[PDB]
């Protein structure tokens, strides 16, 4: 088909006529000892499956606070009766005690 295929030893091939990317015209799915080449009367192309020989990962501890967290916070001091000159502190905690 092209001058470059004369240096190849085809182990097997498929004469598929139809393809999405190109019109077709015998884009032979040919196999070799190491690659899966492809010639379609215009040039030879390599379509072998590339694999990820090097893989690197990362982590992210995404804290998920509750939507109802600062809503109706737990307040045990419903009544805070004190003297006119009292200086008593007030304590309260949010629901689930998360973030806000």
């Amino acid at each position: 088909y092209v001058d470059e295929d004369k240096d190849l030893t085809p182990l097997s091939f498929v004469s598929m006529p139809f393809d999405y990317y190109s019109a077709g015209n015998s884009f032979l799915v040919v196999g070799t000892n190491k690659k899966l080449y492809k010639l379609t009367d215009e040039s030879l192309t390599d379509i072998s499956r590339k694999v990820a020989t090097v893989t690197k990962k990362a982590s992210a501890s995404i804290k998920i606070y509750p939507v109802v967290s600062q809503i109706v916070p737990k307040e045990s001091t419903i009544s805070m009766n004190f003297n006119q000159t009292k200086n008593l502190e007030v304590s309260l905690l949010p629901a689930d005690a998360n973030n806000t």
């Binding site: 088909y1 295929d5 004369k6 240096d7 190849l8 030893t9 085809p10 182990l11 097997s12 091939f13 498929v14 004469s15 598929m16 006529p17 139809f18 393809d19 999405y20 990317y21 019109a23 015209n25 015998s26 032979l28 799915v29 040919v30 196999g31 070799t32 000892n33 190491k34 690659k35 899966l36 009367d41 215009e42 040039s43 390599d46 379509i47 072998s48 499956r49 590339k50 694999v51 990820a52 020989t53 090097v54 893989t55 690197k56 990962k57 990362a58 982590s59 992210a60 501890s61 995404i62 804290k63 998920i64 606070y65 509750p66 939507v67 109802v68 967290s69 689930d96 998360n98 973030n99």
Partner: protein, 446 residues
């Protein structure tokens, strides 16, 4: 190199959204993947993407992780003794070599990829909760039947990955879809709904199964359909697979022969409502439930010795439909014992039941393909002479493709580093190992 993330300590409020993106240390063509420790709790959209939105769903400390991969080419190890089998299904091309995953080239894709759902097995983690545990799956030969894909000589690995070879195993996949291959291969696929972070089980009323037949020495050499009926060969004894069209496990396999069995992995073709098989002893042409020997006492005793001299396993057959011929391919009488290039071919014309012989140019493979030499200008070119030769009378579509491609011609994959036509003008190409040169000589018919 080292991959970082935009946000690693996000604080959402059940419904809040945040888009975290992965940043690898170098820059280039890298694919992306994402993962998480708990199911749901985040609405990860298109986990294959680089920047993923995560909508909070439930309270709890979650651990979201990304995955960046380096797209690089890797050479295959398909030696001559283990060539490609190149099955076809749903306009997609499958590779199917030894030591490698079967692989498929999708109709809407240009790069080969491992078969979707291949190696998947929904195995319960502990006494329950069936999860899709992907195990290492390697096959021997893959073919198609009734919109499915099949597997032979399955080597099924698992957890505790000391793999065990199953020469008796035979698996089938689901039905295909519009320009897509079958999607799953797990036998225990069902009993799983709503799998998010994110496997998917949306089939076409066809599941996957395995039969694990019982015969002599197994090795499950070849399989070939015939009029909606399977015919599997073991080099000894054969079985017929009849699909019953059920929801799950529809295939029913029944014994056919007790002595028949194919010689080579590519030694059966469907010629005319029947199979052409050289069953390790002679040539058999069987139409189902009945078999007749084309080589009873005509070409038996001189085919058997010739094939056995060098390499019986390099046998191949091909249907030459244009001239109603079916030939069997084999190595020549004088050849290296490790050579798999077929030198001589015994041709049988089924239109008149006559046998003959012919020489082939060291065939590594054979097939029918459209003719080359279609005149065109693949690379855009003008040089500096005519300015694209402004066409008169408008132009003729730049090329003729309205007429369907025809004059389909048999082609041969040759050991002589190239492609050869097998049925063309009288000429022959011998090989000279003394000088490592190919010599052309006129074809000598005797």
């Amino acid at each position: 190199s080292s991959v970082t993330l935009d946000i690693v300590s996000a604080s959402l409020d059940v419904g809040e959204e945040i888009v975290i993106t992965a940043t690898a240390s170098p820059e280039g063509e890298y694919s992306y993947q994402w993962s998480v420790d708990k199911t749901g709790y985040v609405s990860t959209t298109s986990v294959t993407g680089k920047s993923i939105k995560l909508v909070a769903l439930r309270k709890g400390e979650i651990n979201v992780t990304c995955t960046v991969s380096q797209m690089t080419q890797k050479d295959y190890d398909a030696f001559d003794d283990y060539p490609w089998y190149h099955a076809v299904i749903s306009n997609c091309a499958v590779a199917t070599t030894h030591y490698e995953t079967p692989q498929v080239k999708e109709f809407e894709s240009e790069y080969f990829v491992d078969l979707p759902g291949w190696g998947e097995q929904t195995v319960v983690d502990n006494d329950g909760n069936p999860s899709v545990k992907k195990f290492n799956w390697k096959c021997e030969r893959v073919r198609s039947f009734n919109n499915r894909l099949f597997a032979l000589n399955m080597r099924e690995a698992n957890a505790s990955g000391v793999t065990t070879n199953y020469p008796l195993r035979l698996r089938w996949s689901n039905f295909a879809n519009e320009n897509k291959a079958p999607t799953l291969w797990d036998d225990f696929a069902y009993d799983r709904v709503v799998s998010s972070d994110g496997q998917t089980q949306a089939l076409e009323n066809g599941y996957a199964g395995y039969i694990d037949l019982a015969d002599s020495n197994g090795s499950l050499i070849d399989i070939l359909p015939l009029k909606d009926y399977l015919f599997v060969y073991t080099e000894f004894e054969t079985y017929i697979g009849s699909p019953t069209n059920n929801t799950y496990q529809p295939l029913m396999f029944k014994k056919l022969f007790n002595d028949s069995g194919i010689l080579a992995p590519e030694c059966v073709v469907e010629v005319e409502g029947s199979h052409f098989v050289v069953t390790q002893n002679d040539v058999i042409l069987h139409n189902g439930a009945t078999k007749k020997s084309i080589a009873s006492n005509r070409v038996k005793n001189m085919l058997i010795n010739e094939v056995c001299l060098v390499n019986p396993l390099a046998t191949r057959v091909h249907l030459h439909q244009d001239k109603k011929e079916v030939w069997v391919l084999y190595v020549g009488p004088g050849e290296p014992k490790e050579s798999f290039a077929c030198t001589k071919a015994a041709v049988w014309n089924y239109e008149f039941d006559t046998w003959s012989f012919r020489t082939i140019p060291y065939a590594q493979c054979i097939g029918l393909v459209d003719p080359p030499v279609l005149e065109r200008g693949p690379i855009w070119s003008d040089f500096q002479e005519i300015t694209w030769d402004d066409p008169s009378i408008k132009e003729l579509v730049w090329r003729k493709d309205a007429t369907n491609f025809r004059q389909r011609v048999t082609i041969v994959g040759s050991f002589l580093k190239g492609f050869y036509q097998v049925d063309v003008g009288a000429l022959d190409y011998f090989y000279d190992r003394l000088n490592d040169v190919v010599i052309e000589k006129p074809l000598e018919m005797r």
